[PDB]
Amino acid sequence: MGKINLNQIYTAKEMSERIGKNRNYLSQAYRNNKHEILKNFNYRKIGGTIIFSDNPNNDLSQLITAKEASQLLGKNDEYFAHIYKRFPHRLEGIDHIYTGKTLFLTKESLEVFKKKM
């Protein structure tokens, strides 16, 4: 039902395998400006990760790094990462995904978390 389905979010290496290519295929397409390939994918640069989805209707502009969400709340860079590792139930009901060795929230789940307090 949402603006983004976090179950359909992959790193470039994972999405490369999902389309049956060597794991470096989409990273190399991006580094080499192969736009005739890239134009067929839903992807976005999100911090240092190029993130892809196999669903064109996923709005990847909703994703934010947990680092950025921490900074937006005026907290240490590791604020959300530290909660997620030690107290994961604090993120019940707060849409998030860990992939590519990075925790991500959404702009709307950051709002949910501020309201919860």
Side-chain angles (χ1 to χ4, degrees):
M1 294 185 178
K3 291 183 183 46
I4 188 170
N5 182 340
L6 296 180
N7 301 288
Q8 296 182 324
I9 293 301
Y10 319 99
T11 63
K13 284 192 219 296
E14 197 169 2
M15 181 72 183
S16 291
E17 304 211 49
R18 290 185 62 91
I19 64 164
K21 301 301 179 177
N22 175 274
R23 65 180 195 257
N24 297 309
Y25 181 102
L26 292 168
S27 297
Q28 284 289 105
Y30 182 89
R31 188 174 69 82
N32 297 128
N33 304 316
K34 303 287 283 169
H35 291 287
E36 293 83 357
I37 291 158
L38 298 160
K39 76 191 183 46
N40 306 300
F41 296 96
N42 185 12
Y43 71 96
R44 182 170 194 92
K45 180 176 197 283
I46 310 176
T49 303
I50 313 306
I51 291 291
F52 285 75
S53 183
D54 61 309
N55 176 349
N57 307 309
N58 253 40
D59 183 359
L60 298 182
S61 79
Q62 297 302 316
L63 277 165
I64 57 173
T65 61
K67 181 176 171 176
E68 181 196 355
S70 300
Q71 294 166 342
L72 291 171
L73 294 186
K75 305 292 169 176
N76 188 276
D77 289 347
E78 295 299 316
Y79 171 82
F80 277 112
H82 183 271
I83 290 167
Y84 171 66
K85 178 162 167 175
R86 285 154 195 78
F87 320 112
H89 199 66
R90 288 232 41 210
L91 302 186
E92 289 296 283
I94 304 306
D95 292 341
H96 67 275
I97 181 182
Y98 190 84
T99 198
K101 305 187 168 197
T102 304
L103 181 63
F104 299 91
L105 272 63
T106 67
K107 288 178 180 180
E108 286 188 337
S109 79
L110 179 63
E111 297 308 313
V112 170
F113 182 87
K114 291 213 292 214
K115 276 187 182 81
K116 178 191 57 192
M117 302 209 105

